[PDB]
Ligand binder design. Sequence first.
Ligand SMILES: [Mg+2]
Ligand SMILES: [Mg+2]
Ligand SMILES: [Mg+2]
Ligand SMILES: [Mg+2]
Ligand SMILES: [Mg+2]
Ligand SMILES: [Mg+2]
Ligand SMILES: [Mg+2]
Ligand SMILES: [Mg+2]
Ligand SMILES: [Mg+2]
Ligand SMILES: [Mg+2]
Ligand SMILES: [Mg+2]
Ligand SMILES: [Mg+2]
Ligand SMILES: [Mg+2]
Ligand SMILES: [Mg+2]
Ligand SMILES: [Mg+2]
Lengths: 102, 50, 151, 215, 100
Amino acid sequence: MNIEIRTDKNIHNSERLITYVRAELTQEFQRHSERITHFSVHFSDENGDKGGDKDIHCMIEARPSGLKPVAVHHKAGNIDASIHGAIEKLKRSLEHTFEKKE
Amino acid sequence: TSPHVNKDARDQYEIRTYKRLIDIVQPTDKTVDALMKLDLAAGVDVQIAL
Amino acid sequence: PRRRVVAAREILPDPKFSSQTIAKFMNHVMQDGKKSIAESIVYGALERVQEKNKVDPVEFFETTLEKVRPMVEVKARRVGGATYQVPMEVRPSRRTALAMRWLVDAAAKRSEKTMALRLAGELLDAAEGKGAAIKKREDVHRMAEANKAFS
Amino acid sequence: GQKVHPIGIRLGVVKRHNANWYANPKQYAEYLLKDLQVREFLTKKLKNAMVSNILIERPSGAAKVTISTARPGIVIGKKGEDIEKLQRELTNIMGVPAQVSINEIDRPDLDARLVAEAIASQLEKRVMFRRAMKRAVQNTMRAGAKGIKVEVSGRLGGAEIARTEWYREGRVPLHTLRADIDYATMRAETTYGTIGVKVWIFRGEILGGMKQVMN
Amino acid sequence: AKKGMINRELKREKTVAKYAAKRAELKATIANVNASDEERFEAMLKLQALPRNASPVRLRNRCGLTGRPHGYFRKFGLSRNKLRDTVMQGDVPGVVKASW
RNA sequence: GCAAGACUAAAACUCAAAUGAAUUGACGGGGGCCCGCACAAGCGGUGGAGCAUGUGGUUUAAUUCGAUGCAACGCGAAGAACCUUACCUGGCCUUGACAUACUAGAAACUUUUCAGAGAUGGAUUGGUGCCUUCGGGAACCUAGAUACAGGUGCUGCAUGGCUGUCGUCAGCUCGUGUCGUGAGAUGUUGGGUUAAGUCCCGCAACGAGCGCAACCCUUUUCCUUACUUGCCAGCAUUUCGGAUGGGAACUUUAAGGAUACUGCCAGUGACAAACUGGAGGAAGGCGGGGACGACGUCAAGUCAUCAUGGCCCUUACGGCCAGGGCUACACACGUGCUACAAUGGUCGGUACAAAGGGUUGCUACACAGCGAUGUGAUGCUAAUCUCAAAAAGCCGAUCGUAGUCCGGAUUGGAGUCUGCAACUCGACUCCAUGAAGUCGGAAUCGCUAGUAAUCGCGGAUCAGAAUGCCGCGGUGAAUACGUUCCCG
Ligand SMILES: [Mg+2]
Ligand SMILES: [Mg+2]
Ligand SMILES: [Mg+2]
Ligand SMILES: [Mg+2]
Ligand SMILES: [Mg+2]
Ligand SMILES: [Mg+2]
Ligand SMILES: [Mg+2]
Ligand SMILES: [Mg+2]
Ligand SMILES: [Mg+2]
Ligand SMILES: [Mg+2]
Ligand SMILES: [Mg+2]
Ligand SMILES: [Mg+2]
Ligand SMILES: [Mg+2]
Ligand SMILES: [Mg+2]
Ligand SMILES: [Mg+2]
């Protein structure tokens, strides 16, 4: 699946982050393989230039071959935490959808 | 209509110009003076040609 | 749709032969609204086929169309998570439409210089009984025959 | 979501423009810019006179400003000297000389702009917002409008979180293009920022269309 | 826009107004056939030696009310942001919403 | 008690809750009932190639700042060579390029050069104006001083104003009553029905408001007014061109009116709403399009249109200038344009539009040029002159399936024009060259009728610079049995 990850001005992005995100996301979602053709993750900081418990928003939206695109959001205090929460939520959502459609 | 970014959200306005033509023939000295004396209301630009 | 019953539009008869069937065939051939070129193609093909054997072009066309029309088709029914292709009869309008589409597509896939020539070749082939449209008719009969068991 | 300007939607239907003149394509921009300048000048000059409308007209090589005021005395002047200065300023602003006319307002509490200024004054003086809102609504309904609506948004009471509160009574059919709806907006500058005020007043349905308006 | 931007625009307009006559005369001399070749060359040199701001090509339209350099709409002289407000207040004569 | 195990029965420690009935929503691989190009039946696309455009990453002195799933990515920008410009290198000013307050001298202005990249600096000409109880004042400069100006610097999570989306989805709520200890409930629920909280019947409800529909614009038929510059049916004259003398018929132009209401007939339904089949009519059951965005949701977007609270810089985070950059290029995405040909390419002839633009402009016509264009010149402030050639189309000839007489990227010479100036970095013209491409993975998009597909024409921005955006007309389809499975 092709991976298209984007951030905002607050978050700060780099090709190193691109490689790491691609690797981790593929490693987690390797089982589905052909079922899914596209991932797009997006990162923001909400109240940019300030702080808080969450203060960062991760999103991941995935296109499954066949059924319609499905999206997931998460809020966390760090980029890694946001990514992990979003990955867990995507895994749960895809498992539920695939069990439903059988 | 949006300050920053919405290309599809717009307002379409129009302005129309209406023109009317009149001729007066065989005019008399009293007719011409009456036409000149007649007052003019705003919003209607009137051109008189001899 | 979920409601209403849309009425069918009227296709005027063709100039030369005054045939609504031939007008509909021209509409199938037509691309990008170039109906004049569509008529040129169809009439050239009809002249070419008439050259081979001296018969009424309209009668030849309708005979070949009857030769190529389908009998029976299946419509996929999704129950119990399976295809369940169920044979069924089809209305005359659908019969004619599929026949015309098959003829035109087979002509398009033939290998002559011009659309008129290859359309005439397809009409001759369908009249003989060996063509791509004949093969699609045979295949649809074969499949609806394999699945006759279900209602 | 968002809503069209109540006046903006009825220009050629039941309302008239606030400017009435003709210009050729070249002098149009100059006329419009100078009209905006004179409106800006008048708004600042007559701040305390409760002015409601300004009608700018260019009949022919001249100008005519009609000012709708609740207090004609202030604008006219005790001995009429103020109007002379006003026309002098208008002629300075506009190339051709301008003449002023005054329209006395005898039912101020039916005018949306006046109500909005009245509420904004109290809000800047730190009266309770929903006290001022109810006072204005009751006064307008006593005046006789078939309906009034008031909206106040911002940091009400100094709150960190801004919010909006509104009150409506009577009828305000915005979607009815044949209805007389007066709309006004005002700003209150308080120590904690800006508060916006919007007023809608409904004066029944106009009959006969623009012809009745005699456009 | 900034007051510096507006003042730069104004000084450019003033310079163009100052030098328009000489610029036009030099261009006419350049385009005059009966004039001598040396005279045409001298006219070209003077036109190239004129101050840069005298050239009208260096002027940018601005809203006037706000000085914004985009969406100018020559006829009204106002950028879209203020033009919409003025129109939908009812202060622009003849302009209405369009539906056709 | 053979065993499995049964009966009797603590404490240490740990939490601020755990619970029962019932009320509002949300949700259900629970249930019925509906709707939507959501499925089904079809037509044409994107994903492959060349180029345009925007973004992400790298790069650089700088590649200025915003927008980020549907709802960011031909988005702010309706148009970056200088300017715009906010960025970088360097040269410069400090009450400042702009406002008010204080003091003093000078009309304002004006002609020439000199130094320099320019900003700036140093010289040098001409005038001495407008009103005055003329002894002083308006304009517009110069010089000094102090509060101050200045900020596209931060915070859209402190705001006003404005905007997106669910979504034109059909819903969302109040007063007086009632019911319940209460949260709350009724009304807004039940039958039919509509596109619809649209309507008719019942009913502790009776009444209202915001939404739905109607009022608004445009198109189809006809009537009155108007006869221009626009029109030519009967007459005549014609260098046969409405050209002319003429006419006010027709087309048209643009204001005002009429018409269509299930109005009438035959059926169905509770004898209700309402729904089918008909006559007449240009048009028959919302005729087709456009504006119009309910209560509310996402600390959704915008401090860079603008305003504004609070923080920050003050010989610089302010101001002026010359060059460079925003156009970079191992790559990755989104939206497009052009093609891969014979339903076609080339050549000759030959018909039919609608909507807009034109005085700092559009330009008939002659010449010069292969051409982009140039010169002379003509009519236009326009139903008058002009942009202007409509193109697909039709008739005739050639091409005869070839990387081609298909395709037109890239490169080498020669030019025109706009502009102070086309090196970075413009549009177009001519000669030469002739690339990938022979129909495009998984996947996925638009569209139900004058629609899709295809063909050309205009405009805002604008000195010049559209394959983008907003409009206009020409030719003109395919298919809907049905809601079973797909989604909201
Ligand atoms: Mg936010
Ligand atoms: Mg500013
Ligand atoms: Mg320019
Ligand atoms: Mg399908
Ligand atoms: Mg787009
Ligand atoms: Mg630049
Ligand atoms: Mg927000
Ligand atoms: Mg942001
Ligand atoms: Mg409506
Ligand atoms: Mg910012
Ligand atoms: Mg520069
Ligand atoms: Mg750019
Ligand atoms: Mg070629
Ligand atoms: Mg090849
Ligand atoms: Mg241009």
